[PDB]
Amino acid sequence: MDTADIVWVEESVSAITLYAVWLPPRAREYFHALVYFVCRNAAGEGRARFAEVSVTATELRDFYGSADVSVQAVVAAARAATTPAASPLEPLENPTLWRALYACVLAALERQTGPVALFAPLRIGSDPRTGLVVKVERASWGPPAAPRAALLVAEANIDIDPMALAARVAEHPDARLAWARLAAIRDTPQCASAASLTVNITTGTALFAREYQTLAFPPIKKEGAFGDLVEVCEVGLRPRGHPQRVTARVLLPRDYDYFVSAGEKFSAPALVALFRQWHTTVHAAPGALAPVFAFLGPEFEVRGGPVPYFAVLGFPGWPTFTVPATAESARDLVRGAAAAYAALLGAWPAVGARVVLPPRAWPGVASAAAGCLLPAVREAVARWHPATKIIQLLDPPAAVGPVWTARFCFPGLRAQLLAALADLGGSGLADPHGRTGLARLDALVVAAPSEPWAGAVLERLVPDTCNACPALRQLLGGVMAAVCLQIEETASSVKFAVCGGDGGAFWGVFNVDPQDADAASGVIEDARRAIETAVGAVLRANAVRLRHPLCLALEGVYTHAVAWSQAGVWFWNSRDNTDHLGGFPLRGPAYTTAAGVVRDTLRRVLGLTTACVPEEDALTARGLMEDACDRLILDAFNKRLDAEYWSVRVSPFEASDPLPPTAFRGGALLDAEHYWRRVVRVCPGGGESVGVPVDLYPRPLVLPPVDCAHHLREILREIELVFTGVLAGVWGEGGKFVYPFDDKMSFLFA
Amino acid sequence: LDGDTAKAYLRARTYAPGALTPAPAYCGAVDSATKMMGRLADAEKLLVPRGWPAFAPASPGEDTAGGTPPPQTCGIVKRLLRLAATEQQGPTPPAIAALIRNAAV
């Protein structure tokens, strides 16, 4: 604490990692952790610095989200992870424990030492006698060193008995195959030592190539030196929680800050095996402490995750970004990944929603925010239910003919409202140090309009936050309902009539002569301005301070609209031929052709309606729809032999065909299944109609005839939904639209 | 049917143009019923690793009765017809080439 011996250095921090987690001499209420920073100077020079933090059981329980966690379990898991030769997949037991551990350690480090940011200039003050970083301040010593990347390509051949994978899958009916592979590798770690590996690392200064026939034997093909990528450093420390002096051995990268691996084929087991071999080799000579060996990803959960990532919490010490390939926009993808890593401190997506606030602190903030606002708003919030209708709208099937329609939108309203309401509830925060998460959220919200990566981060983060605290759902719903009520009240006076939407996005009709676009474009802008001003005033009157100012955006202007359900709607502009279709399922490459066909047919029918005719018009529309369906089915015959075109995507929360026993022999192909499973349907006999997981087999595939009749019926159901809605709305017809498939077209596939 | 659809249908639903054409000798899979079943099993074993669904047949006197007790002759005939009627995608030889054991079929 004494400032007479602190040595201050200007530097930048490239990554923060977890090194050791130990229980102090006699302490059953808290534990100590040793965090490791890989700092860099103004010209570029790796240095290794260490800080020590103390985490109590209360913070661990708060970040965990429950009360079934103990410091003893955390210490046991951390000590087990220190030996990857026997337990290389410790976070696979309880991923939430490690997420809570990382969040707690990061928060404690941020609060005790000071404001820590990655890739930003800082002044670090360390104690010469202890060797530990004691203070961090934010300064400005010019342009900090620019981050440097290093391309990585790892390919491993791990063999696991398909019987074990089948048994594990049978244990969990909805488990993903990547998790099954990881669990099987966990059960017998010796399978990772006998695998064959190939690693290629390309930095801006050197190259590193290795080919191991067996990971336990010397490489057969070698290029470059391990002393060129990373430098091994030994440091001495005297933590206050350690009775005697200790030593730490670390890997400092040279000429790079993080690894970047494309998305062509990323396998977690290959990287895990490579890093495990590195850990075994480096931490063999006695004398120092062994760092924890933990990783996280979407494959460490039974049901997977929708976003692929790879989080390093310990060894080696630097992050690894997985970026999908074959995009011409790969560079912007990598830039966005780096920006997200720097902005959110590297916790997201690993920790999850804990990067904002601990999951056991949301109820207090939500209650405090609800206590504020206005009486009517509070009554609306308390009564909110997901099935209540706030403002009266059009009832499908409906159709608005020649009018001046207009789609409006508030881009990012839920995120802005959450940021504003968390600030309102901040008085309910137990301590003023939780403000850092809300500041991070505010930065994300501010940067979202101009940075797409921030928009994606928020779109994935807000639902997680709502899931964490079910009391946030009602708080957001009530405010959205108030916003919709104000929107309706204001629009009732600018020649507007709202016909749909939920409050963040809506559309409506205008009361204006439908022939003068020049005079019609001047009313839409006035209505937009008035609506934006009214919504802003209503939000301000409730003390809700929107950090980023509101902005209503006109998404389009049309002349015809047809609604066939509560979510599906078709807008058409009869002067420019532009149109918009919403609510049509797209779960495969064959659902895009159907969408195009539907849009073209609807364009033709609604253009025919302009000429105008009696019910004869409805008959003509029916004929056109039947013709369109016929042509679609006829064109679908030339793609009868393609299996990836007819394959449909399935989520982990639906009923799917049982996995054929031959799908577990794929090998490295099962390491890429974490959320979606593509299944095609084939007919090997009379009426078998079995299902085939397309992506679990090597190519090319040898399959029986595809079951295009079943797939075409599934698509035709959706097509007929839209066509029936259009017929019922535009011409008032009770007669549903049905297409005879089994009578006129089923022969092409039988 | 009209256009390229007519040509595709005609090519995909009749014998190959060179099937019923005189050749110096025959290229096929001719054998008795039992040996034919054995060859079919071998070909199915060759084909399964690439997506082809397995057969899973029943048999009286087994340790699992189940259902579908058809005679071996009917089953072999249906499997042969299905294999012979399966077309080829691109330059890859059809599935019957796993039983006939010739890549030019």
JSON list of N, CA, C and O in Angstrom, two decimals, chain A residues 1 18 20-25 27 29-35 51-60 63 71 74-75 101-113 132-133 239-242:
[
{"chain": "A", "resi": 1, "resn": "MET", "atom": "N", "xyz": [0.82, -1.20, 0.00]},
{"chain": "A", "resi": 1, "resn": "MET", "atom": "CA", "xyz": [0.00, 0.00, 0.00]},
{"chain": "A", "resi": 1, "resn": "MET", "atom": "C", "xyz": [0.86, 1.26, 0.00]},
{"chain": "A", "resi": 1, "resn": "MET", "atom": "O", "xyz": [0.46, 2.30, -0.52]},
{"chain": "A", "resi": 18, "resn": "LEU", "atom": "N", "xyz": [-5.38, -16.74, -16.33]},
{"chain": "A", "resi": 18, "resn": "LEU", "atom": "CA", "xyz": [-5.42, -17.31, -15.00]},
{"chain": "A", "resi": 18, "resn": "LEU", "atom": "C", "xyz": [-4.28, -18.32, -14.85]},
{"chain": "A", "resi": 18, "resn": "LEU", "atom": "O", "xyz": [-4.14, -19.23, -15.67]},
{"chain": "A", "resi": 20, "resn": "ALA", "atom": "N", "xyz": [-2.80, -19.54, -11.27]},
{"chain": "A", "resi": 20, "resn": "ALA", "atom": "CA", "xyz": [-2.89, -20.43, -10.12]},
{"chain": "A", "resi": 20, "resn": "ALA", "atom": "C", "xyz": [-4.05, -19.99, -9.24]},
{"chain": "A", "resi": 20, "resn": "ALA", "atom": "O", "xyz": [-4.40, -18.82, -9.17]},
{"chain": "A", "resi": 21, "resn": "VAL", "atom": "N", "xyz": [-4.64, -20.97, -8.55]},
{"chain": "A", "resi": 21, "resn": "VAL", "atom": "CA", "xyz": [-5.75, -20.73, -7.64]},
{"chain": "A", "resi": 21, "resn": "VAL", "atom": "C", "xyz": [-5.55, -21.59, -6.40]},
{"chain": "A", "resi": 21, "resn": "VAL", "atom": "O", "xyz": [-5.74, -22.81, -6.44]},
{"chain": "A", "resi": 22, "resn": "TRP", "atom": "N", "xyz": [-5.18, -20.97, -5.28]},
{"chain": "A", "resi": 22, "resn": "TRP", "atom": "CA", "xyz": [-4.86, -21.72, -4.08]},
{"chain": "A", "resi": 22, "resn": "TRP", "atom": "C", "xyz": [-5.60, -21.16, -2.87]},
{"chain": "A", "resi": 22, "resn": "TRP", "atom": "O", "xyz": [-5.95, -19.98, -2.81]},
{"chain": "A", "resi": 23, "resn": "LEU", "atom": "N", "xyz": [-5.84, -22.04, -1.90]},
{"chain": "A", "resi": 23, "resn": "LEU", "atom": "CA", "xyz": [-6.45, -21.65, -0.64]},
{"chain": "A", "resi": 23, "resn": "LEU", "atom": "C", "xyz": [-5.37, -21.18, 0.33]},
{"chain": "A", "resi": 23, "resn": "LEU", "atom": "O", "xyz": [-4.45, -21.94, 0.62]},
{"chain": "A", "resi": 24, "resn": "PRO", "atom": "N", "xyz": [-5.45, -19.95, 0.85]},
{"chain": "A", "resi": 24, "resn": "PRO", "atom": "CA", "xyz": [-4.38, -19.43, 1.70]},
{"chain": "A", "resi": 24, "resn": "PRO", "atom": "C", "xyz": [-4.15, -20.33, 2.90]},
{"chain": "A", "resi": 24, "resn": "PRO", "atom": "O", "xyz": [-4.90, -21.29, 3.13]},
{"chain": "A", "resi": 25, "resn": "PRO", "atom": "N", "xyz": [-3.11, -20.04, 3.71]},
{"chain": "A", "resi": 25, "resn": "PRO", "atom": "CA", "xyz": [-2.69, -20.97, 4.76]},
{"chain": "A", "resi": 25, "resn": "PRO", "atom": "C", "xyz": [-3.83, -21.58, 5.56]},
{"chain": "A", "resi": 25, "resn": "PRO", "atom": "O", "xyz": [-3.95, -22.81, 5.63]},
{"chain": "A", "resi": 27, "resn": "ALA", "atom": "N", "xyz": [-7.79, -20.66, 5.54]},
{"chain": "A", "resi": 27, "resn": "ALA", "atom": "CA", "xyz": [-8.90, -19.83, 5.09]},
{"chain": "A", "resi": 27, "resn": "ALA", "atom": "C", "xyz": [-9.95, -20.66, 4.36]},
{"chain": "A", "resi": 27, "resn": "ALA", "atom": "O", "xyz": [-9.72, -21.12, 3.24]},
{"chain": "A", "resi": 29, "resn": "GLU", "atom": "N", "xyz": [-13.11, -19.42, 3.90]},
{"chain": "A", "resi": 29, "resn": "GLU", "atom": "CA", "xyz": [-14.10, -18.49, 3.40]},
{"chain": "A", "resi": 29, "resn": "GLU", "atom": "C", "xyz": [-13.74, -17.87, 2.05]},
{"chain": "A", "resi": 29, "resn": "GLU", "atom": "O", "xyz": [-14.64, -17.36, 1.38]},
{"chain": "A", "resi": 30, "resn": "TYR", "atom": "N", "xyz": [-12.48, -17.90, 1.65]},
{"chain": "A", "resi": 30, "resn": "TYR", "atom": "CA", "xyz": [-12.04, -17.24, 0.43]},
{"chain": "A", "resi": 30, "resn": "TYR", "atom": "C", "xyz": [-10.86, -18.00, -0.14]},
{"chain": "A", "resi": 30, "resn": "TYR", "atom": "O", "xyz": [-10.34, -18.94, 0.47]},
{"chain": "A", "resi": 31, "resn": "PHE", "atom": "N", "xyz": [-10.43, -17.58, -1.33]},
{"chain": "A", "resi": 31, "resn": "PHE", "atom": "CA", "xyz": [-9.26, -18.16, -1.97]},
{"chain": "A", "resi": 31, "resn": "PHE", "atom": "C", "xyz": [-8.46, -17.04, -2.63]},
{"chain": "A", "resi": 31, "resn": "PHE", "atom": "O", "xyz": [-8.91, -15.90, -2.74]},
{"chain": "A", "resi": 32, "resn": "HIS", "atom": "N", "xyz": [-7.25, -17.38, -3.05]},
{"chain": "A", "resi": 32, "resn": "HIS", "atom": "CA", "xyz": [-6.37, -16.46, -3.75]},
{"chain": "A", "resi": 32, "resn": "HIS", "atom": "C", "xyz": [-6.10, -16.96, -5.16]},
{"chain": "A", "resi": 32, "resn": "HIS", "atom": "O", "xyz": [-6.02, -18.17, -5.40]},
{"chain": "A", "resi": 33, "resn": "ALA", "atom": "N", "xyz": [-5.96, -16.02, -6.08]},
{"chain": "A", "resi": 33, "resn": "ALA", "atom": "CA", "xyz": [-5.68, -16.33, -7.48]},
{"chain": "A", "resi": 33, "resn": "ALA", "atom": "C", "xyz": [-4.52, -15.48, -7.95]},
{"chain": "A", "resi": 33, "resn": "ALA", "atom": "O", "xyz": [-4.32, -14.35, -7.48]},
{"chain": "A", "resi": 34, "resn": "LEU", "atom": "N", "xyz": [-3.75, -16.02, -8.89]},
{"chain": "A", "resi": 34, "resn": "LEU", "atom": "CA", "xyz": [-2.58, -15.34, -9.46]},
{"chain": "A", "resi": 34, "resn": "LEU", "atom": "C", "xyz": [-2.82, -15.15, -10.95]},
{"chain": "A", "resi": 34, "resn": "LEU", "atom": "O", "xyz": [-2.82, -16.12, -11.71]},
{"chain": "A", "resi": 35, "resn": "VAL", "atom": "N", "xyz": [-3.02, -13.90, -11.35]},
{"chain": "A", "resi": 35, "resn": "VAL", "atom": "CA", "xyz": [-3.31, -13.54, -12.74]},
{"chain": "A", "resi": 35, "resn": "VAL", "atom": "C", "xyz": [-2.02, -13.12, -13.43]},
{"chain": "A", "resi": 35, "resn": "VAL", "atom": "O", "xyz": [-1.13, -12.52, -12.81]},
{"chain": "A", "resi": 51, "resn": "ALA", "atom": "N", "xyz": [-0.15, -10.50, -10.93]},
{"chain": "A", "resi": 51, "resn": "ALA", "atom": "CA", "xyz": [-0.89, -9.86, -9.86]},
{"chain": "A", "resi": 51, "resn": "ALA", "atom": "C", "xyz": [-1.57, -10.95, -9.04]},
{"chain": "A", "resi": 51, "resn": "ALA", "atom": "O", "xyz": [-1.82, -12.05, -9.54]},
{"chain": "A", "resi": 52, "resn": "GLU", "atom": "N", "xyz": [-1.86, -10.65, -7.78]},
{"chain": "A", "resi": 52, "resn": "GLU", "atom": "CA", "xyz": [-2.53, -11.60, -6.91]},
{"chain": "A", "resi": 52, "resn": "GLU", "atom": "C", "xyz": [-3.79, -10.96, -6.36]},
{"chain": "A", "resi": 52, "resn": "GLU", "atom": "O", "xyz": [-3.75, -9.83, -5.88]},
{"chain": "A", "resi": 53, "resn": "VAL", "atom": "N", "xyz": [-4.90, -11.70, -6.42]},
{"chain": "A", "resi": 53, "resn": "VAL", "atom": "CA", "xyz": [-6.19, -11.19, -5.97]},
{"chain": "A", "resi": 53, "resn": "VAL", "atom": "C", "xyz": [-6.81, -12.20, -5.01]},
{"chain": "A", "resi": 53, "resn": "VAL", "atom": "O", "xyz": [-6.46, -13.38, -5.01]},
{"chain": "A", "resi": 54, "resn": "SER", "atom": "N", "xyz": [-7.73, -11.71, -4.19]},
{"chain": "A", "resi": 54, "resn": "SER", "atom": "CA", "xyz": [-8.43, -12.53, -3.22]},
{"chain": "A", "resi": 54, "resn": "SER", "atom": "C", "xyz": [-9.92, -12.49, -3.54]},
{"chain": "A", "resi": 54, "resn": "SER", "atom": "O", "xyz": [-10.49, -11.40, -3.69]},
{"chain": "A", "resi": 55, "resn": "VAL", "atom": "N", "xyz": [-10.54, -13.66, -3.63]},
{"chain": "A", "resi": 55, "resn": "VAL", "atom": "CA", "xyz": [-11.95, -13.78, -3.97]},
{"chain": "A", "resi": 55, "resn": "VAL", "atom": "C", "xyz": [-12.66, -14.50, -2.84]},
{"chain": "A", "resi": 55, "resn": "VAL", "atom": "O", "xyz": [-12.26, -15.60, -2.45]},
{"chain": "A", "resi": 56, "resn": "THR", "atom": "N", "xyz": [-13.71, -13.88, -2.31]},
{"chain": "A", "resi": 56, "resn": "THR", "atom": "CA", "xyz": [-14.48, -14.48, -1.23]},
{"chain": "A", "resi": 56, "resn": "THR", "atom": "C", "xyz": [-15.56, -15.39, -1.79]},
{"chain": "A", "resi": 56, "resn": "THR", "atom": "O", "xyz": [-15.84, -15.40, -2.99]},
{"chain": "A", "resi": 57, "resn": "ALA", "atom": "N", "xyz": [-16.16, -16.19, -0.90]},
{"chain": "A", "resi": 57, "resn": "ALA", "atom": "CA", "xyz": [-17.21, -17.10, -1.33]},
{"chain": "A", "resi": 57, "resn": "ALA", "atom": "C", "xyz": [-18.46, -16.36, -1.77]},
{"chain": "A", "resi": 57, "resn": "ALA", "atom": "O", "xyz": [-19.22, -16.85, -2.62]},
{"chain": "A", "resi": 58, "resn": "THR", "atom": "N", "xyz": [-18.71, -15.18, -1.20]},
{"chain": "A", "resi": 58, "resn": "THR", "atom": "CA", "xyz": [-19.90, -14.42, -1.56]},
{"chain": "A", "resi": 58, "resn": "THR", "atom": "C", "xyz": [-19.87, -14.00, -3.03]},
{"chain": "A", "resi": 58, "resn": "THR", "atom": "O", "xyz": [-20.87, -14.15, -3.74]},
{"chain": "A", "resi": 59, "resn": "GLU", "atom": "N", "xyz": [-18.73, -13.49, -3.50]},
{"chain": "A", "resi": 59, "resn": "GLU", "atom": "CA", "xyz": [-18.62, -13.11, -4.90]},
{"chain": "A", "resi": 59, "resn": "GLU", "atom": "C", "xyz": [-18.76, -14.32, -5.81]},
{"chain": "A", "resi": 59, "resn": "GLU", "atom": "O", "xyz": [-19.38, -14.25, -6.88]},
{"chain": "A", "resi": 60, "resn": "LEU", "atom": "N", "xyz": [-18.17, -15.45, -5.42]},
{"chain": "A", "resi": 60, "resn": "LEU", "atom": "CA", "xyz": [-18.27, -16.66, -6.23]},
{"chain": "A", "resi": 60, "resn": "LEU", "atom": "C", "xyz": [-19.72, -17.11, -6.35]},
{"chain": "A", "resi": 60, "resn": "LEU", "atom": "O", "xyz": [-20.18, -17.48, -7.43]},
{"chain": "A", "resi": 63, "resn": "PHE", "atom": "N", "xyz": [-21.65, -14.61, -8.69]},
{"chain": "A", "resi": 63, "resn": "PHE", "atom": "CA", "xyz": [-21.39, -14.78, -10.11]},
{"chain": "A", "resi": 63, "resn": "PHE", "atom": "C", "xyz": [-21.85, -16.14, -10.63]},
{"chain": "A", "resi": 63, "resn": "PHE", "atom": "O", "xyz": [-22.19, -16.27, -11.81]},
{"chain": "A", "resi": 71, "resn": "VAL", "atom": "N", "xyz": [-15.90, -22.75, -2.20]},
{"chain": "A", "resi": 71, "resn": "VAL", "atom": "CA", "xyz": [-14.51, -22.46, -2.54]},
{"chain": "A", "resi": 71, "resn": "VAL", "atom": "C", "xyz": [-13.69, -23.74, -2.60]},
{"chain": "A", "resi": 71, "resn": "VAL", "atom": "O", "xyz": [-12.72, -23.83, -3.35]},
{"chain": "A", "resi": 74, "resn": "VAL", "atom": "N", "xyz": [-13.97, -25.15, -6.09]},
{"chain": "A", "resi": 74, "resn": "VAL", "atom": "CA", "xyz": [-13.19, -24.35, -7.03]},
{"chain": "A", "resi": 74, "resn": "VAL", "atom": "C", "xyz": [-11.71, -24.68, -6.90]},
{"chain": "A", "resi": 74, "resn": "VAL", "atom": "O", "xyz": [-11.00, -24.85, -7.90]},
{"chain": "A", "resi": 75, "resn": "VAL", "atom": "N", "xyz": [-11.21, -24.76, -5.66]},
{"chain": "A", "resi": 75, "resn": "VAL", "atom": "CA", "xyz": [-9.80, -25.06, -5.45]},
{"chain": "A", "resi": 75, "resn": "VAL", "atom": "C", "xyz": [-9.47, -26.46, -5.95]},
{"chain": "A", "resi": 75, "resn": "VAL", "atom": "O", "xyz": [-8.42, -26.68, -6.57]},
{"chain": "A", "resi": 101, "resn": "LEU", "atom": "N", "xyz": [-15.81, -18.68, -12.09]},
{"chain": "A", "resi": 101, "resn": "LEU", "atom": "CA", "xyz": [-14.45, -18.43, -11.60]},
{"chain": "A", "resi": 101, "resn": "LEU", "atom": "C", "xyz": [-13.78, -17.32, -12.40]},
{"chain": "A", "resi": 101, "resn": "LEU", "atom": "O", "xyz": [-13.20, -16.39, -11.83]},
{"chain": "A", "resi": 102, "resn": "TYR", "atom": "N", "xyz": [-13.85, -17.41, -13.73]},
{"chain": "A", "resi": 102, "resn": "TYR", "atom": "CA", "xyz": [-13.20, -16.40, -14.57]},
{"chain": "A", "resi": 102, "resn": "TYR", "atom": "C", "xyz": [-13.83, -15.03, -14.34]},
{"chain": "A", "resi": 102, "resn": "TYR", "atom": "O", "xyz": [-13.12, -14.02, -14.22]},
{"chain": "A", "resi": 103, "resn": "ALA", "atom": "N", "xyz": [-15.16, -14.97, -14.27]},
{"chain": "A", "resi": 103, "resn": "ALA", "atom": "CA", "xyz": [-15.82, -13.69, -14.05]},
{"chain": "A", "resi": 103, "resn": "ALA", "atom": "C", "xyz": [-15.43, -13.09, -12.70]},
{"chain": "A", "resi": 103, "resn": "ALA", "atom": "O", "xyz": [-15.14, -11.89, -12.61]},
{"chain": "A", "resi": 104, "resn": "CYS", "atom": "N", "xyz": [-15.43, -13.90, -11.64]},
{"chain": "A", "resi": 104, "resn": "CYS", "atom": "CA", "xyz": [-15.07, -13.40, -10.32]},
{"chain": "A", "resi": 104, "resn": "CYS", "atom": "C", "xyz": [-13.64, -12.89, -10.29]},
{"chain": "A", "resi": 104, "resn": "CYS", "atom": "O", "xyz": [-13.36, -11.82, -9.74]},
{"chain": "A", "resi": 105, "resn": "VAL", "atom": "N", "xyz": [-12.71, -13.66, -10.87]},
{"chain": "A", "resi": 105, "resn": "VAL", "atom": "CA", "xyz": [-11.32, -13.24, -10.86]},
{"chain": "A", "resi": 105, "resn": "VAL", "atom": "C", "xyz": [-11.15, -11.95, -11.64]},
{"chain": "A", "resi": 105, "resn": "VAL", "atom": "O", "xyz": [-10.43, -11.04, -11.21]},
{"chain": "A", "resi": 106, "resn": "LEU", "atom": "N", "xyz": [-11.80, -11.84, -12.80]},
{"chain": "A", "resi": 106, "resn": "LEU", "atom": "CA", "xyz": [-11.68, -10.63, -13.60]},
{"chain": "A", "resi": 106, "resn": "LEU", "atom": "C", "xyz": [-12.23, -9.42, -12.86]},
{"chain": "A", "resi": 106, "resn": "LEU", "atom": "O", "xyz": [-11.62, -8.35, -12.86]},
{"chain": "A", "resi": 107, "resn": "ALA", "atom": "N", "xyz": [-13.39, -9.57, -12.21]},
{"chain": "A", "resi": 107, "resn": "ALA", "atom": "CA", "xyz": [-13.97, -8.46, -11.47]},
{"chain": "A", "resi": 107, "resn": "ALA", "atom": "C", "xyz": [-13.08, -8.04, -10.30]},
{"chain": "A", "resi": 107, "resn": "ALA", "atom": "O", "xyz": [-12.86, -6.85, -10.07]},
{"chain": "A", "resi": 108, "resn": "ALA", "atom": "N", "xyz": [-12.56, -9.02, -9.55]},
{"chain": "A", "resi": 108, "resn": "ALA", "atom": "CA", "xyz": [-11.69, -8.70, -8.42]},
{"chain": "A", "resi": 108, "resn": "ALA", "atom": "C", "xyz": [-10.42, -8.00, -8.89]},
{"chain": "A", "resi": 108, "resn": "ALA", "atom": "O", "xyz": [-9.97, -7.04, -8.26]},
{"chain": "A", "resi": 109, "resn": "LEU", "atom": "N", "xyz": [-9.82, -8.47, -9.98]},
{"chain": "A", "resi": 109, "resn": "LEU", "atom": "CA", "xyz": [-8.63, -7.81, -10.51]},
{"chain": "A", "resi": 109, "resn": "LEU", "atom": "C", "xyz": [-8.95, -6.40, -10.97]},
{"chain": "A", "resi": 109, "resn": "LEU", "atom": "O", "xyz": [-8.17, -5.47, -10.72]},
{"chain": "A", "resi": 110, "resn": "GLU", "atom": "N", "xyz": [-10.08, -6.21, -11.65]},
{"chain": "A", "resi": 110, "resn": "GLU", "atom": "CA", "xyz": [-10.46, -4.89, -12.13]},
{"chain": "A", "resi": 110, "resn": "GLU", "atom": "C", "xyz": [-10.70, -3.92, -10.98]},
{"chain": "A", "resi": 110, "resn": "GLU", "atom": "O", "xyz": [-10.39, -2.73, -11.11]},
{"chain": "A", "resi": 111, "resn": "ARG", "atom": "N", "xyz": [-11.25, -4.40, -9.87]},
{"chain": "A", "resi": 111, "resn": "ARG", "atom": "CA", "xyz": [-11.54, -3.53, -8.73]},
{"chain": "A", "resi": 111, "resn": "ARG", "atom": "C", "xyz": [-10.33, -3.25, -7.85]},
{"chain": "A", "resi": 111, "resn": "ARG", "atom": "O", "xyz": [-10.11, -2.10, -7.46]},
{"chain": "A", "resi": 112, "resn": "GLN", "atom": "N", "xyz": [-9.53, -4.27, -7.54]},
{"chain": "A", "resi": 112, "resn": "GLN", "atom": "CA", "xyz": [-8.43, -4.09, -6.60]},
{"chain": "A", "resi": 112, "resn": "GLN", "atom": "C", "xyz": [-7.28, -3.32, -7.23]},
{"chain": "A", "resi": 112, "resn": "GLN", "atom": "O", "xyz": [-6.87, -2.26, -6.74]},
{"chain": "A", "resi": 113, "resn": "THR", "atom": "N", "xyz": [-6.73, -3.84, -8.33]},
{"chain": "A", "resi": 113, "resn": "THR", "atom": "CA", "xyz": [-5.60, -3.18, -8.97]},
{"chain": "A", "resi": 113, "resn": "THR", "atom": "C", "xyz": [-6.01, -1.85, -9.60]},
{"chain": "A", "resi": 113, "resn": "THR", "atom": "O", "xyz": [-5.36, -0.82, -9.39]},
{"chain": "A", "resi": 132, "resn": "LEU", "atom": "N", "xyz": [5.13, -8.26, -7.66]},
{"chain": "A", "resi": 132, "resn": "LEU", "atom": "CA", "xyz": [3.74, -8.33, -8.09]},
{"chain": "A", "resi": 132, "resn": "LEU", "atom": "C", "xyz": [3.25, -6.95, -8.49]},
{"chain": "A", "resi": 132, "resn": "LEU", "atom": "O", "xyz": [3.65, -5.94, -7.90]},
{"chain": "A", "resi": 133, "resn": "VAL", "atom": "N", "xyz": [2.38, -6.91, -9.50]},
{"chain": "A", "resi": 133, "resn": "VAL", "atom": "CA", "xyz": [1.75, -5.65, -9.89]},
{"chain": "A", "resi": 133, "resn": "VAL", "atom": "C", "xyz": [0.77, -5.23, -8.80]},
{"chain": "A", "resi": 133, "resn": "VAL", "atom": "O", "xyz": [-0.06, -6.02, -8.35]},
{"chain": "A", "resi": 239, "resn": "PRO", "atom": "N", "xyz": [3.79, -14.15, -3.04]},
{"chain": "A", "resi": 239, "resn": "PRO", "atom": "CA", "xyz": [2.39, -13.85, -2.73]},
{"chain": "A", "resi": 239, "resn": "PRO", "atom": "C", "xyz": [2.17, -13.84, -1.22]},
{"chain": "A", "resi": 239, "resn": "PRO", "atom": "O", "xyz": [2.79, -14.60, -0.47]},
{"chain": "A", "resi": 240, "resn": "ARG", "atom": "N", "xyz": [1.29, -12.94, -0.77]},
{"chain": "A", "resi": 240, "resn": "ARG", "atom": "CA", "xyz": [1.01, -12.85, 0.66]},
{"chain": "A", "resi": 240, "resn": "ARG", "atom": "C", "xyz": [0.29, -14.09, 1.17]},
{"chain": "A", "resi": 240, "resn": "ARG", "atom": "O", "xyz": [0.37, -14.41, 2.36]},
{"chain": "A", "resi": 241, "resn": "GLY", "atom": "N", "xyz": [-0.40, -14.81, 0.29]},
{"chain": "A", "resi": 241, "resn": "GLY", "atom": "CA", "xyz": [-1.07, -16.04, 0.66]},
{"chain": "A", "resi": 241, "resn": "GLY", "atom": "C", "xyz": [-0.22, -17.28, 0.59]},
{"chain": "A", "resi": 241, "resn": "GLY", "atom": "O", "xyz": [-0.72, -18.38, 0.85]},
{"chain": "A", "resi": 242, "resn": "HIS", "atom": "N", "xyz": [1.06, -17.15, 0.25]},
{"chain": "A", "resi": 242, "resn": "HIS", "atom": "CA", "xyz": [1.97, -18.29, 0.16]},
{"chain": "A", "resi": 242, "resn": "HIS", "atom": "C", "xyz": [3.01, -18.19, 1.27]},
{"chain": "A", "resi": 242, "resn": "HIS", "atom": "O", "xyz": [3.65, -17.14, 1.42]}
]
